[PDB]
Amino acid sequence: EGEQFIKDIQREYVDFLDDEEDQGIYAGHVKDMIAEKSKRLIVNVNDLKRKNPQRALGLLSNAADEQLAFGRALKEYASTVDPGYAKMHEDLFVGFEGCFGNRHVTPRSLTSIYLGNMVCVEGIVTKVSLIRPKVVRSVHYCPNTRKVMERKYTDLTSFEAVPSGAAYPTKDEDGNLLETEYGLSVYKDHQTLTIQEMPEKAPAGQLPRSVDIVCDDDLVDRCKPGDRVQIVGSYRCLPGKRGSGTFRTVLLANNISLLSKESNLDISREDIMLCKKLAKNNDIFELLSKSLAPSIGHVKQAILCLLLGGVEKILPNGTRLRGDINVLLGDPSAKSQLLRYVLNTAPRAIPTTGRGSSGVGLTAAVTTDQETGERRLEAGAMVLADRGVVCIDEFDKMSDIDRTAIHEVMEQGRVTISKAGIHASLNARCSVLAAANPVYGRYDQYKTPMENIGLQDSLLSRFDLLFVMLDVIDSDVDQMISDHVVRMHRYRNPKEADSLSFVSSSEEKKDTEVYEKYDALLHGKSRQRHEKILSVEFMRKYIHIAKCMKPKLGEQACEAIANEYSRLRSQEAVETDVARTQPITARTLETLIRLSTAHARARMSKSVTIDDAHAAIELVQFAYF
Amino acid sequence: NQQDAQINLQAVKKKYKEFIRTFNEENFFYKYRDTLKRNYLNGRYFLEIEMEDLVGFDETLADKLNKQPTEHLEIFEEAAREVADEITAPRPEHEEHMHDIQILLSSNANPTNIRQLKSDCVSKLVKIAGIIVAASGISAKATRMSIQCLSCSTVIPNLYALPRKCNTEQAGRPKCPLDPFFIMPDKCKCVDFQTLKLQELPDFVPQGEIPRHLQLFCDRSLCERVVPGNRVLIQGIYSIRKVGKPSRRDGREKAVVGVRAPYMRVVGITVDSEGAGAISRYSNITSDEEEHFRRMAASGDIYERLSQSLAPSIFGSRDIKKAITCMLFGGSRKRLPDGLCRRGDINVLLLGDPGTAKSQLLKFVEKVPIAVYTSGKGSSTASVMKDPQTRNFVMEGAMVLADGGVVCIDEFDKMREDDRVAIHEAMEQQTISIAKAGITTTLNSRCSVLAAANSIFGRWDDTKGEENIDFMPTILSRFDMIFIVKDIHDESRDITLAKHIINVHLSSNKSAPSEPAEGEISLSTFKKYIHYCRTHCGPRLSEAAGEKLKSRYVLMRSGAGQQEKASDKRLSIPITVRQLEAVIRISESLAKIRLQPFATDEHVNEALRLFQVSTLDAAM
Amino acid sequence: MDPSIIEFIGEKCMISIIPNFSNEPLHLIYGPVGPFRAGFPVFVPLWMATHLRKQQKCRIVPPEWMDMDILEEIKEEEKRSKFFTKMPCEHYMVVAQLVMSTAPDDVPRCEELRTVIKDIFDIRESKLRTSIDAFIKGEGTYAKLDNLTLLEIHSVRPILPYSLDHIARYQRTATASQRDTSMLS
DNA sequence: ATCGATCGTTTTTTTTTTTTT
DNA sequence: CGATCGAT
Ligand SMILES: Nc1ncnc2c1ncn2[C@@H]1O[C@H](COP(=O)(O)OP(=O)(O)OP(=O)(O)O)[C@@H](O)[C@H]1O
Ligand SMILES: Nc1ncnc2c1ncn2[C@@H]1O[C@H](COP(=O)(O)OP(=O)(O)OP(=O)(O)O)[C@@H](O)[C@H]1O
Ligand SMILES: Nc1ncnc2c1ncn2[C@@H]1O[C@H](COP(=O)(O)OP(=O)(O)O)[C@@H](O)[C@H]1O
């Protein structure tokens, strides 16, 4: 209880709880009468300015105990309101949250100011780290005297002061009994991590800088390293600085925004209703075909099913199999730019290099005097893509060491792995792509189908189809592709009878003249579509339920798969394609199963049809047919 | 306060305080008050100063300023705030609170060299000129703070001893001794700290040796001031961090007597003007400059004049050079809401008989804003090291140093293929990938590249057919304009080359009668001109250009395929999407030069005739 | 609003000086002019001592507000002058420049003098920024001139008002128009 | 000279990347 | 756990 404005400030927050605003909304049915018990309340400063700006911006310049007082006054309020939750005898800090915009600097720009402030960050989830508990206070006991004293301890990372330094008591009075009662002696949760600039604003003549973060109990580990984030907290700087040796920083006092979900969406059971209304429309698959790659011929009809992970199949204490799909094929010049349609279009999309050691999936766990006693640990580069897909470029240029190290969990669909320190295992059941090249460029068809590629013929069964990709034109199609490519060049740049300018309106405007660069809709509405039915967001809003629905098998599958596999192994190894009939095996069944499983999710028909049979075979024959 | 000399007061008392109020010429500009106030208005908190004003004022300070500058240059700060806070008062009501400021120093005295920065030259102001390598991030530092134990803002001279007594002694006789200090950074401060760096010159004892270098320091406003790979002029000061001679001999087997460490802090860095020594990121350029720029852009005789800017001692290769500089400007990073960030920067190939001045030409293209040169056997896997302090795995990751600049190399042929592939790739997507240790940071940077080479068998391969490259056609892919170099004979050509270079090669010849040519002048100007013209205009096509260019590429591929058929076998280069995707950037470079945004197809018939060199080169 | 337009206003003011002639090749103008006799003061405007001193014709002396103590006390009064202060001739910022160009050939202490005039100029100007820092609710019927001088105010003139019309049109429309429950434009 | 109360006291790690022949 | 340092 420092300078007595603190209590004035307490009651100024009590003065929040007068009428409709807080006596109506914000006090009562807010954490405890709703009983989820998040001691961290939701404040937004703007209402506080609308009562006491001395408490709005007196906070965002100094936060010594205005927070302490806020939590105090709140607990005393609910102590009046509701003694049932009066058993949590702690600070019960609060939010002071918001998507406000006072000062929202980068990790680069927490720059010699803002000390003693409550401000924003954005950046990358990185180094999501290990947990520990923390000390609050100790409920001791003396059987000699039947006396239960108590002792609370602090440190700067929680509030200002420090304990009057000493360890836990022993014979503290004169020699009587000091039985430390635990269970009554309590503990929060603790955590520590860092963030980087989602960097692409970085000047690569310069270094994208780093930050320092601390967290606490009900905030503990709320997303994964590999995601995008915005956060808003307060700031402190403890260490010595030549009174002894220089200075460092830390951040806290905060609530989160992860800004890449779907559950973030205000989801009723209506979005499903829009999907299922339009779901019946049959030739929508072709729309999704022309959807994700609108800027390029060419495939993606199939790539979808990679993009959907797969389907789970387990037996009664028997085995399990991995459900997912994997393919790839091509000389240079749309191959090397069909991979970043995922990095920045769909989630859980983490490309890899083509050149990678000790953490393409390894960790190597090398450690040097961690804050705790972690003798060995790091993480890797696969669980980032658990339950989805992956990109690479320069695959044939990859080492042939770790190719087999792929085959491990790829073909197993399991982890039973370790770096020899502790046996480790889990379920990461992932897919992947990469890129490709014939060792000499323009060759895959004249000389041979195989051996213009030159590698193990073992994988081709691990993958699904031998396939084709080439580039030539005859005398007639050249102007057709010319007009296609020139549609590419114009349906992208804006703005495309004696005098036709000087029209009633012009380019002269206030605030809707050119957003970035405008585009056309002419004759892509002869293609009767819309920018919302054919879009990003309604597309992705139909991601979740096809991943929740589970289209079981019909019955007419069996005779058809039989006849077609029969003819496949009969006469696919003839007619100019024999050396591209090498990998035929008893594996086209399970891929066909993943196929109809996926396609039966693209309209969510928990069922099976012969039309799906055509859909799932015709691509396979179209490989060469 | 021993008021005899070297006193704390006399300087601040009136002298420094009144120097500026007194600093006068009519025109009523000539103070540092106006600059100070108008700097304050925009959050600057500094001002610029000379060191030969004291001669304008007096004859004593300077030979005392050099001696103990560490104090004088803070008396300056105090005098500054007290002489400026009076003006912070519009009346006494709008100094909501004062603030701290940083002074600058400058001169034109002379640059020194690192080989002489010695024990005499210590604690002493100076001037040098080096070059920059890299320097740290932005950590922290402050000046004072309070402690709960005493509740006093702890005031320091040096930028630690923390004595015994408690000061929570008002506990009765039960006091708290043995240093109980609770640092209260609610009450502390915060300034900056960045640790700049310095390499020595390229001509000043590196000869039978290697070049050393030095590390640096800053406080408040000289972070966000220097990006590395730059030429500086400097005023700093040479001082230490630790101290001691006697037999407290250091470490385990260290310090025979007394060796403490070097560094410098800056008091008034500035930059260089090697023509445009420092014109890379900031803008101290003035309206006269921009008028000059646009009025030369207004000049419709600028490009052919610029065909003669790199060859004032070189003859020939003019059709060759109509786009050797168009490389520099870059076109447009016309990105799109999907992935298709269609390729921004531009790339070139050249290869042929030696004796034709490839090396000197690329040295010059380095000369004329940002660039580097190695060639083979080795700028940039990218570099995942492990920090010898704390043993963490940081990424130095050096095409990053072309993050808008360009690159030139020969010696693609003469270096093996373990290191071509990451760079095979970067220059189609500009994203340096990483997946090696526990990091997936897909870095990126916009560099171009220039590619010289050497064909084994020379013009023999070039006479008959397919021995063009020794390595691959997938890097025959990525480049637009590709140039033979021959030295076909002619005696007229021979004699003209003869006297042309001798008149060059005679008595360090062309000082006076060189620049008297038309307008072919000042590569400095080109540094500035380029760093301007790329930094504004974002053009793209006009409608009439598109159809003819489209039909032209059509006929290009048809002729390549017919030569395929006119020989009954493939006689072509691959007619790629990349070829049009690059000639678009040649149009873009042209419009970047003249600054007209919308470019017409007559503007680009020049492009047609220049890549026609590549077409008719790989015509056979 | 200019550097010389106000000298058509300011430079017409008068002092009294000494010439070295008596009445000239002409005697005197039909006008307020005094009789010309050397060795004695004569009252003139100050668009002519300019013409005369540099014509090497005369000496000259200043007014009395051109001093030290007046210009040492006016400032400290002006400190807590919440509104304005003493006004010696009310455009002394133009007289002093056209004074201190030449006359400092023989004027005394023409430097500490300049120091103070700058010291007073800047402060009064800066005050004339913070007057703005209370202007709320369209107070275009309330302002200050009470001991203003003019050489400070023209440094603002074109800026605010050519804006202030459409600025406070939203509220100047209020006491000039009508609408339903909300504020009008 | 003797005893006692004063002063001040701290140490723990193993492994991954690029390079050269 | 060691040495300093004060008085008895
Ligand atoms: N139909 C198309 N769809 C998408 N992009 C195209 C198309 N046609 C041409 N392009 C463009 O042409 C350029 C050709 O380069 P491309 O990315 O194909 O090389 P690459 O596939 O990486 O070569 P490699 O497979 O040998 O690595 C690309 O920038 C691509 O955007
Ligand atoms: N046509 C020319 N006019 C003027 N000087 C020339 C000409 N050709 C060559 N020189 C001079 O000859 C030298 C050529 O050396 P350079 O390093 O260019 O060889 P190169 O042409 O690059 O051969 P390589 O590519 O095999 O190294 C340069 O110093 C250059 O100044
Ligand atoms: N005789 C068989 N019994 C059971 N499964 C078989 C048989 N022949 C082929 N299969 C198929 O082969 C798969 C396992 O084959 P696998 O051992 O992976 O082949 P490979 O030895 O080429 O790796 C099963 O999923 C099943 O679908």
PDB file of N, CA, C and O in Angstrom, chain B residues 464-511:
ATOM      1  N   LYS B 464      30.523 -24.719 -85.438  1.00  0.00           N
ATOM      2  CA  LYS B 464      29.595 -25.828 -85.590  1.00  0.00           C
ATOM      3  C   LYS B 464      28.614 -25.827 -84.422  1.00  0.00           C
ATOM      4  O   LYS B 464      28.467 -24.808 -83.745  1.00  0.00           O
ATOM      5  N   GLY B 465      27.919 -26.936 -84.188  1.00  0.00           N
ATOM      6  CA  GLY B 465      26.790 -26.904 -83.279  1.00  0.00           C
ATOM      7  C   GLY B 465      27.012 -27.110 -81.789  1.00  0.00           C
ATOM      8  O   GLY B 465      27.704 -26.323 -81.137  1.00  0.00           O
ATOM      9  N   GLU B 466      26.444 -28.192 -81.250  1.00  0.00           N
ATOM     10  CA  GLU B 466      26.058 -28.249 -79.838  1.00  0.00           C
ATOM     11  C   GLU B 466      27.222 -28.667 -78.950  1.00  0.00           C
ATOM     12  O   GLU B 466      27.350 -29.820 -78.533  1.00  0.00           O
ATOM     13  N   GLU B 467      28.072 -27.700 -78.642  1.00  0.00           N
ATOM     14  CA  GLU B 467      28.992 -27.763 -77.513  1.00  0.00           C
ATOM     15  C   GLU B 467      28.972 -26.453 -76.753  1.00  0.00           C
ATOM     16  O   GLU B 467      30.008 -25.967 -76.291  1.00  0.00           O
ATOM     17  N   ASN B 468      27.788 -25.854 -76.625  1.00  0.00           N
ATOM     18  CA  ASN B 468      27.704 -24.482 -76.136  1.00  0.00           C
ATOM     19  C   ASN B 468      28.128 -24.387 -74.675  1.00  0.00           C
ATOM     20  O   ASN B 468      29.104 -23.702 -74.348  1.00  0.00           O
ATOM     21  N   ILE B 469      27.418 -25.073 -73.781  1.00  0.00           N
ATOM     22  CA  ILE B 469      27.811 -25.163 -72.383  1.00  0.00           C
ATOM     23  C   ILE B 469      28.422 -26.537 -72.164  1.00  0.00           C
ATOM     24  O   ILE B 469      28.244 -27.466 -72.956  1.00  0.00           O
ATOM     25  N   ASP B 470      29.182 -26.651 -71.085  1.00  0.00           N
ATOM     26  CA  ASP B 470      29.691 -27.917 -70.605  1.00  0.00           C
ATOM     27  C   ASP B 470      28.825 -28.532 -69.513  1.00  0.00           C
ATOM     28  O   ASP B 470      29.045 -29.698 -69.170  1.00  0.00           O
ATOM     29  N   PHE B 471      27.848 -27.795 -68.962  1.00  0.00           N
ATOM     30  CA  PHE B 471      27.152 -28.226 -67.749  1.00  0.00           C
ATOM     31  C   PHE B 471      25.663 -28.523 -67.898  1.00  0.00           C
ATOM     32  O   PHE B 471      25.274 -29.663 -67.622  1.00  0.00           O
ATOM     33  N   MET B 472      24.799 -27.593 -68.304  1.00  0.00           N
ATOM     34  CA  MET B 472      23.374 -27.922 -68.285  1.00  0.00           C
ATOM     35  C   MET B 472      22.580 -26.864 -69.050  1.00  0.00           C
ATOM     36  O   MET B 472      23.052 -25.741 -69.223  1.00  0.00           O
ATOM     37  N   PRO B 473      21.374 -27.214 -69.507  1.00  0.00           N
ATOM     38  CA  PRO B 473      20.472 -26.247 -70.151  1.00  0.00           C
ATOM     39  C   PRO B 473      19.437 -25.628 -69.219  1.00  0.00           C
ATOM     40  O   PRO B 473      18.652 -24.792 -69.678  1.00  0.00           O
ATOM     41  N   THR B 474      19.419 -26.014 -67.946  1.00  0.00           N
ATOM     42  CA  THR B 474      18.464 -25.483 -66.986  1.00  0.00           C
ATOM     43  C   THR B 474      18.892 -24.143 -66.426  1.00  0.00           C
ATOM     44  O   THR B 474      18.115 -23.497 -65.716  1.00  0.00           O
ATOM     45  N   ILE B 475      20.126 -23.757 -66.714  1.00  0.00           N
ATOM     46  CA  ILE B 475      20.632 -22.420 -66.475  1.00  0.00           C
ATOM     47  C   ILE B 475      20.951 -21.725 -67.785  1.00  0.00           C
ATOM     48  O   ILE B 475      21.126 -20.498 -67.798  1.00  0.00           O
ATOM     49  N   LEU B 476      20.901 -22.442 -68.906  1.00  0.00           N
ATOM     50  CA  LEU B 476      20.504 -21.799 -70.148  1.00  0.00           C
ATOM     51  C   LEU B 476      19.060 -21.304 -70.090  1.00  0.00           C
ATOM     52  O   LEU B 476      18.655 -20.512 -70.947  1.00  0.00           O
ATOM     53  N   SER B 477      18.268 -21.767 -69.117  1.00  0.00           N
ATOM     54  CA  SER B 477      16.863 -21.382 -69.029  1.00  0.00           C
ATOM     55  C   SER B 477      16.698 -19.991 -68.439  1.00  0.00           C
ATOM     56  O   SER B 477      16.039 -19.128 -69.027  1.00  0.00           O
ATOM     57  N   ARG B 478      17.275 -19.774 -67.263  1.00  0.00           N
ATOM     58  CA  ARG B 478      16.901 -18.659 -66.413  1.00  0.00           C
ATOM     59  C   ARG B 478      17.309 -17.283 -66.933  1.00  0.00           C
ATOM     60  O   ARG B 478      16.901 -16.291 -66.322  1.00  0.00           O
ATOM     61  N   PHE B 479      18.099 -17.177 -68.003  1.00  0.00           N
ATOM     62  CA  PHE B 479      18.670 -15.897 -68.424  1.00  0.00           C
ATOM     63  C   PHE B 479      18.102 -15.465 -69.774  1.00  0.00           C
ATOM     64  O   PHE B 479      17.794 -16.296 -70.632  1.00  0.00           O
ATOM     65  N   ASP B 480      17.998 -14.147 -69.965  1.00  0.00           N
ATOM     66  CA  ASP B 480      17.294 -13.577 -71.116  1.00  0.00           C
ATOM     67  C   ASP B 480      18.212 -13.264 -72.291  1.00  0.00           C
ATOM     68  O   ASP B 480      18.004 -13.776 -73.397  1.00  0.00           O
ATOM     69  N   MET B 481      19.175 -12.368 -72.084  1.00  0.00           N
ATOM     70  CA  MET B 481      20.094 -11.926 -73.124  1.00  0.00           C
ATOM     71  C   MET B 481      21.454 -12.556 -72.897  1.00  0.00           C
ATOM     72  O   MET B 481      22.062 -12.384 -71.835  1.00  0.00           O
ATOM     73  N   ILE B 482      21.920 -13.272 -73.909  1.00  0.00           N
ATOM     74  CA  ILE B 482      23.029 -14.202 -73.812  1.00  0.00           C
ATOM     75  C   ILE B 482      23.949 -13.929 -74.984  1.00  0.00           C
ATOM     76  O   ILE B 482      23.500 -13.921 -76.136  1.00  0.00           O
ATOM     77  N   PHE B 483      25.234 -13.728 -74.699  1.00  0.00           N
ATOM     78  CA  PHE B 483      26.136 -13.094 -75.651  1.00  0.00           C
ATOM     79  C   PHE B 483      27.380 -13.923 -75.898  1.00  0.00           C
ATOM     80  O   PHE B 483      28.125 -14.246 -74.966  1.00  0.00           O
ATOM     81  N   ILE B 484      27.602 -14.229 -77.176  1.00  0.00           N
ATOM     82  CA  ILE B 484      28.887 -14.707 -77.637  1.00  0.00           C
ATOM     83  C   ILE B 484      29.909 -13.614 -77.361  1.00  0.00           C
ATOM     84  O   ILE B 484      29.575 -12.425 -77.307  1.00  0.00           O
ATOM     85  N   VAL B 485      31.162 -14.009 -77.160  1.00  0.00           N
ATOM     86  CA  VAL B 485      32.289 -13.100 -77.332  1.00  0.00           C
ATOM     87  C   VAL B 485      33.284 -13.775 -78.271  1.00  0.00           C
ATOM     88  O   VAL B 485      33.867 -14.810 -77.929  1.00  0.00           O
ATOM     89  N   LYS B 486      33.473 -13.186 -79.447  1.00  0.00           N
ATOM     90  CA  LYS B 486      34.514 -13.545 -80.397  1.00  0.00           C
ATOM     91  C   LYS B 486      35.501 -12.393 -80.519  1.00  0.00           C
ATOM     92  O   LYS B 486      35.274 -11.288 -80.021  1.00  0.00           O
ATOM     93  N   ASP B 487      36.619 -12.669 -81.178  1.00  0.00           N
ATOM     94  CA  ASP B 487      37.598 -11.661 -81.559  1.00  0.00           C
ATOM     95  C   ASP B 487      37.965 -11.828 -83.029  1.00  0.00           C
ATOM     96  O   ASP B 487      39.136 -11.925 -83.399  1.00  0.00           O
ATOM     97  N   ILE B 488      36.935 -11.896 -83.880  1.00  0.00           N
ATOM     98  CA  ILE B 488      37.132 -12.054 -85.317  1.00  0.00           C
ATOM     99  C   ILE B 488      38.006 -10.922 -85.857  1.00  0.00           C
ATOM    100  O   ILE B 488      37.971  -9.787 -85.370  1.00  0.00           O
ATOM    101  N   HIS B 489      38.806 -11.246 -86.869  1.00  0.00           N
ATOM    102  CA  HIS B 489      39.903 -10.393 -87.301  1.00  0.00           C
ATOM    103  C   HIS B 489      39.420  -9.285 -88.230  1.00  0.00           C
ATOM    104  O   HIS B 489      38.471  -9.457 -88.999  1.00  0.00           O
ATOM    105  N   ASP B 490      40.102  -8.143 -88.158  1.00  0.00           N
ATOM    106  CA  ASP B 490      40.102  -7.153 -89.229  1.00  0.00           C
ATOM    107  C   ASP B 490      41.185  -6.129 -88.934  1.00  0.00           C
ATOM    108  O   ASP B 490      41.279  -5.626 -87.810  1.00  0.00           O
ATOM    109  N   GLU B 491      41.999  -5.801 -89.936  1.00  0.00           N
ATOM    110  CA  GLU B 491      43.158  -4.959 -89.676  1.00  0.00           C
ATOM    111  C   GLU B 491      42.751  -3.544 -89.303  1.00  0.00           C
ATOM    112  O   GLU B 491      43.425  -2.895 -88.498  1.00  0.00           O
ATOM    113  N   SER B 492      41.683  -3.031 -89.907  1.00  0.00           N
ATOM    114  CA  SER B 492      41.155  -1.744 -89.473  1.00  0.00           C
ATOM    115  C   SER B 492      40.795  -1.799 -87.996  1.00  0.00           C
ATOM    116  O   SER B 492      41.221  -0.951 -87.199  1.00  0.00           O
ATOM    117  N   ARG B 493      40.045  -2.832 -87.614  1.00  0.00           N
ATOM    118  CA  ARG B 493      39.696  -3.046 -86.218  1.00  0.00           C
ATOM    119  C   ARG B 493      40.948  -3.190 -85.376  1.00  0.00           C
ATOM    120  O   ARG B 493      41.026  -2.671 -84.258  1.00  0.00           O
ATOM    121  N   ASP B 494      41.958  -3.854 -85.929  1.00  0.00           N
ATOM    122  CA  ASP B 494      43.190  -4.101 -85.201  1.00  0.00           C
ATOM    123  C   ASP B 494      43.894  -2.797 -84.867  1.00  0.00           C
ATOM    124  O   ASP B 494      44.210  -2.525 -83.705  1.00  0.00           O
ATOM    125  N   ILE B 495      44.129  -1.963 -85.879  1.00  0.00           N
ATOM    126  CA  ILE B 495      44.857  -0.717 -85.667  1.00  0.00           C
ATOM    127  C   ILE B 495      44.066   0.199 -84.758  1.00  0.00           C
ATOM    128  O   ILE B 495      44.627   0.936 -83.932  1.00  0.00           O
ATOM    129  N   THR B 496      42.749   0.200 -84.921  1.00  0.00           N
ATOM    130  CA  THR B 496      41.934   1.111 -84.141  1.00  0.00           C
ATOM    131  C   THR B 496      41.931   0.712 -82.676  1.00  0.00           C
ATOM    132  O   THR B 496      42.056   1.573 -81.800  1.00  0.00           O
ATOM    133  N   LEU B 497      41.816  -0.586 -82.385  1.00  0.00           N
ATOM    134  CA  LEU B 497      42.105  -1.055 -81.037  1.00  0.00           C
ATOM    135  C   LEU B 497      43.500  -0.669 -80.599  1.00  0.00           C
ATOM    136  O   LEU B 497      43.731  -0.399 -79.418  1.00  0.00           O
ATOM    137  N   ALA B 498      44.440  -0.646 -81.536  1.00  0.00           N
ATOM    138  CA  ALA B 498      45.825  -0.389 -81.194  1.00  0.00           C
ATOM    139  C   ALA B 498      45.981   0.996 -80.601  1.00  0.00           C
ATOM    140  O   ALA B 498      46.311   1.152 -79.420  1.00  0.00           O
ATOM    141  N   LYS B 499      45.694   2.018 -81.394  1.00  0.00           N
ATOM    142  CA  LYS B 499      45.887   3.360 -80.889  1.00  0.00           C
ATOM    143  C   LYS B 499      44.865   3.713 -79.828  1.00  0.00           C
ATOM    144  O   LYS B 499      45.151   4.564 -78.979  1.00  0.00           O
ATOM    145  N   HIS B 500      43.695   3.067 -79.843  1.00  0.00           N
ATOM    146  CA  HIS B 500      42.627   3.484 -78.948  1.00  0.00           C
ATOM    147  C   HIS B 500      43.038   3.295 -77.504  1.00  0.00           C
ATOM    148  O   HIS B 500      42.777   4.153 -76.655  1.00  0.00           O
ATOM    149  N   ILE B 501      43.687   2.173 -77.211  1.00  0.00           N
ATOM    150  CA  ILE B 501      44.080   1.890 -75.846  1.00  0.00           C
ATOM    151  C   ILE B 501      45.437   2.488 -75.521  1.00  0.00           C
ATOM    152  O   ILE B 501      45.761   2.661 -74.339  1.00  0.00           O
ATOM    153  N   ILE B 502      46.249   2.791 -76.528  1.00  0.00           N
ATOM    154  CA  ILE B 502      47.565   3.325 -76.232  1.00  0.00           C
ATOM    155  C   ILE B 502      47.431   4.766 -75.819  1.00  0.00           C
ATOM    156  O   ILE B 502      48.016   5.207 -74.826  1.00  0.00           O
ATOM    157  N   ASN B 503      46.617   5.495 -76.563  1.00  0.00           N
ATOM    158  CA  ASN B 503      46.201   6.827 -76.167  1.00  0.00           C
ATOM    159  C   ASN B 503      45.545   6.818 -74.793  1.00  0.00           C
ATOM    160  O   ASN B 503      45.617   7.810 -74.062  1.00  0.00           O
ATOM    161  N   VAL B 504      44.946   5.695 -74.410  1.00  0.00           N
ATOM    162  CA  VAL B 504      44.571   5.483 -73.018  1.00  0.00           C
ATOM    163  C   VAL B 504      45.819   5.220 -72.199  1.00  0.00           C
ATOM    164  O   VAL B 504      46.061   5.863 -71.173  1.00  0.00           O
ATOM    165  N   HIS B 505      46.638   4.291 -72.649  1.00  0.00           N
ATOM    166  CA  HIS B 505      47.658   3.698 -71.816  1.00  0.00           C
ATOM    167  C   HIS B 505      48.915   4.570 -71.713  1.00  0.00           C
ATOM    168  O   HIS B 505      49.981   4.046 -71.367  1.00  0.00           O
ATOM    169  N   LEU B 506      48.835   5.877 -71.990  1.00  0.00           N
ATOM    170  CA  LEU B 506      50.013   6.730 -72.125  1.00  0.00           C
ATOM    171  C   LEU B 506      49.946   7.889 -71.137  1.00  0.00           C
ATOM    172  O   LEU B 506      49.162   8.822 -71.317  1.00  0.00           O
ATOM    173  N   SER B 507      50.776   7.817 -70.094  1.00  0.00           N
ATOM    174  CA  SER B 507      51.029   8.920 -69.167  1.00  0.00           C
ATOM    175  C   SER B 507      49.843   9.190 -68.253  1.00  0.00           C
ATOM    176  O   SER B 507      49.657  10.323 -67.807  1.00  0.00           O
ATOM    177  N   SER B 508      49.069   8.161 -67.927  1.00  0.00           N
ATOM    178  CA  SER B 508      47.826   8.329 -67.187  1.00  0.00           C
ATOM    179  C   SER B 508      46.965   9.359 -67.908  1.00  0.00           C
ATOM    180  O   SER B 508      46.582  10.392 -67.362  1.00  0.00           O
ATOM    181  N   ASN B 509      46.664   9.036 -69.159  1.00  0.00           N
ATOM    182  CA  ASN B 509      46.491  10.050 -70.192  1.00  0.00           C
ATOM    183  C   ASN B 509      45.344  11.022 -69.922  1.00  0.00           C
ATOM    184  O   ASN B 509      45.578  12.203 -69.648  1.00  0.00           O
ATOM    185  N   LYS B 510      44.107  10.536 -69.988  1.00  0.00           N
ATOM    186  CA  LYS B 510      42.932  11.388 -70.188  1.00  0.00           C
ATOM    187  C   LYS B 510      42.406  11.946 -68.860  1.00  0.00           C
ATOM    188  O   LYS B 510      41.449  11.437 -68.270  1.00  0.00           O
ATOM    189  N   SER B 511      43.048  13.018 -68.379  1.00  0.00           N
ATOM    190  CA  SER B 511      42.485  13.841 -67.304  1.00  0.00           C
ATOM    191  C   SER B 511      41.706  15.031 -67.858  1.00  0.00           C
ATOM    192  O   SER B 511      40.515  15.192 -67.582  1.00  0.00           O
TER     193      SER B 511
END
